[PDB]
Enzyme design. Structure first.
Site, PDB file in Angstrom:
ATOM      1  N   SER A  47     -32.690  45.435  11.472  1.00  0.00           N
ATOM      2  CA  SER A  47     -33.451  45.913  12.889  1.00  0.00           C
ATOM      3  C   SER A  47     -33.277  44.593  13.948  1.00  0.00           C
ATOM      4  O   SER A  47     -34.006  44.797  15.106  1.00  0.00           O
ATOM      5  CB  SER A  47     -34.660  45.924  12.483  1.00  0.00           C
ATOM      6  OG  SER A  47     -34.746  47.165  11.445  1.00  0.00           O
ATOM      7  N   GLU A 145     -27.136  53.742  10.118  1.00  0.00           N
ATOM      8  CA  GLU A 145     -25.694  53.475   9.515  1.00  0.00           C
ATOM      9  C   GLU A 145     -25.446  51.889   9.425  1.00  0.00           C
ATOM     10  O   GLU A 145     -24.845  51.301   8.744  1.00  0.00           O
ATOM     11  CB  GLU A 145     -24.432  54.114  10.052  1.00  0.00           C
ATOM     12  CG  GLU A 145     -24.532  55.672   9.883  1.00  0.00           C
ATOM     13  CD  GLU A 145     -25.695  56.489  10.770  1.00  0.00           C
ATOM     14  OE1 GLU A 145     -26.319  55.977  11.921  1.00  0.00           O
ATOM     15  OE2 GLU A 145     -26.287  57.233  10.078  1.00  0.00           O
TER      16      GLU A 145
HETATM   17  O1  LIG Z   1     -34.566  50.717   9.621  1.00  0.00           O
HETATM   18  C1  LIG Z   1     -35.381  49.856   9.028  1.00  0.00           C
HETATM   19  C2  LIG Z   1     -36.634  49.218   9.582  1.00  0.00           C
HETATM   20  C3  LIG Z   1     -37.270  48.369   8.892  1.00  0.00           C
HETATM   21  C4  LIG Z   1     -38.663  47.508   9.591  1.00  0.00           C
HETATM   22  P1  LIG Z   1     -37.621  45.704   9.966  1.00  0.00           P
HETATM   23  O2  LIG Z   1     -36.196  46.031   9.807  1.00  0.00           O
HETATM   24  O3  LIG Z   1     -38.040  45.583  11.328  1.00  0.00           O
HETATM   25  O4  LIG Z   1     -38.145  45.116   8.932  1.00  0.00           O
HETATM   26  C5  LIG Z   1     -37.445  48.343   7.227  1.00  0.00           C
HETATM   27  C6  LIG Z   1     -38.048  47.643   6.586  1.00  0.00           C
HETATM   28  C7  LIG Z   1     -38.151  47.380   5.208  1.00  0.00           C
HETATM   29  C8  LIG Z   1     -37.244  48.491   4.499  1.00  0.00           C
HETATM   30 BR1  LIG Z   1     -36.722  48.347   2.799  1.00  0.00          BR
HETATM   31  C9  LIG Z   1     -36.402  49.142   5.349  1.00  0.00           C
HETATM   32  C10 LIG Z   1     -36.316  49.036   6.812  1.00  0.00           C
HETATM   33  N1  LIG Z   1     -35.071  49.920   7.599  1.00  0.00           N
HETATM   34  C11 LIG Z   1     -34.240  50.611   6.908  1.00  0.00           C
HETATM   35  C12 LIG Z   1     -34.415  51.953   6.150  1.00  0.00           C
HETATM   36  C13 LIG Z   1     -35.765  52.467   6.341  1.00  0.00           C
HETATM   37  C14 LIG Z   1     -35.532  53.860   5.536  1.00  0.00           C
HETATM   38  C15 LIG Z   1     -36.929  54.524   5.133  1.00  0.00           C
HETATM   39  C16 LIG Z   1     -36.736  55.464   4.571  1.00  0.00           C
HETATM   40  C17 LIG Z   1     -35.420  56.020   4.020  1.00  0.00           C
HETATM   41  C18 LIG Z   1     -34.182  55.297   4.428  1.00  0.00           C
HETATM   42  C19 LIG Z   1     -34.530  54.196   5.228  1.00  0.00           C
END
Ligand SMILES: O=c1cc(CP(=O)(O)O)c2ccc(Br)cc2n1/C=C\Cc1ccccc1
EC number: 3.5.2.6
Length: 269
Positions: A47, A145
């Site tokens: 992110s 992705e």
């Molecule tokens: O795209 C993101 C965004 C965040 C918040 P951050 O990046 O700023 O810390 C995030 C936080 C913890 C996790 Br573990 C995965 C995350 N993800 C990636 C996957 C999120 C997700 C949720 C449900 C199902 C599939 C993917």
């Protein structure tokens, strides 16, 4: 003023306990003193590109009348996972400024994809980074992705040093005009997702703006921040982690511990 040797051994021990790789670059903007550990290796952005995305939108707003106030409307299909602001305005839409705020302060994935589209996609954000002198940064893909965090894959990566260098130019240097710079700083200051990372290493009486990234695989997570210690010049730092196995878990405590070591290395209290 390469103060890494004060903390090089501790960094090795932290990454050994973590079971992965830790990359740190920290810059004392007063002296120019620096702390480097794996600062030139590529780590997945996750992110963390969203902060740069917001800065690129602010850059375009300097040249394009009314860009921040443009209402953006989107369909259910834009609502990829972790879209906690844009899911509440599905039926109404949001302005470019609100999408930018949501991308920075809530890591909103739909908001990030909508702003990427405004810039012409990952290549357009990459082009903005090239324009401020960043030759390391690459975004290749969209959310989700870009989170694959494949070992050895340079797609959707930068280096801690390049991240810190670009963050300094955009928050404290002259890459943005003064108002856009202060908006960028205010967005990072108001971030809600980083309380267990660099912020956990910083005393309550210091100002901090950060952007988090968490890929969810390969123990890959990160944070970058501009820290304003009282009575001294601001600190800019980046803390990135990865691990060899897809199953490996990220650790917010390791990111905080790494930020602590970087500040100790720079001799800040
Ligand atoms: O795209 C993101 C965004 C965040 C918040 P951050 O990046 O700023 O810390 C995030 C936080 C913890 C996790 Br573990 C995965 C995350 N993800 C990636 C996957 C999120 C997700 C949720 C449900 C199902 C599939 C993917």
């Amino acid at each position: 003023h390469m103060l890494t040797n004060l903390v090089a051994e501790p960094f090795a021990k932290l990454e050994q306990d973590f079971g992965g790789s830790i990359g740190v670059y920290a810059m004392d903007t007063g002296s120019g003193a620096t702390v480097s550990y794996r600062a030139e290796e590529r780590f997945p952005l996750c992110s963390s590109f969203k902060g740069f995305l917001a800065a690129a939108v602010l850059a375009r707003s300097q040249q394009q009348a009314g860009l921040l106030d443009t209402p953006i409307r989107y369909g259910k299909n834009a609502l990829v996972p972790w879209s906690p602001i844009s899911e509440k305005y599905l039926t109404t839409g949001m302005t470019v400024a609100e999408l930018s705020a949501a991308a920075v302060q809530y890591s909103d994935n739909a908001a990030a994809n909508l702003l990427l589209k405004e810039l012409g996609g990952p290549a357009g954000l990459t082009a903005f980074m090239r324009s401020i002198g960043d030759t390391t940064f690459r975004l290749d893909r969209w959310e989700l992705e870009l989170n694959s965090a494949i070992p050895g894959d340079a797609r959707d990566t930068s280096s801690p040093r390049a991240v810190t260098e670009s963050l300094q130019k955009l928050t404290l240097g002259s890459a943005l005009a003064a108002p856009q710079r202060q908006q960028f700083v205010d967005w990072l200051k108001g971030n809600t997702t980083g309380n267990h990372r660099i912020r956990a290493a910083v005393p309550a009486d210091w100002a901090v703006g950060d952007k988090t990234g968490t890929c969810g695989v390969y123990g890959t997570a990160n944070d970058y921040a501009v820290v304003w210690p009282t009575g001294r010049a601001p600190i800019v730092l980046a803390v990135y982690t990865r691990a060899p196995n897809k199953d490996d878990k990220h650790s917010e405590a390791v990111i905080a511990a790494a930020a602590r070591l970087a500040l100790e290395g720079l001799g800040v209290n």
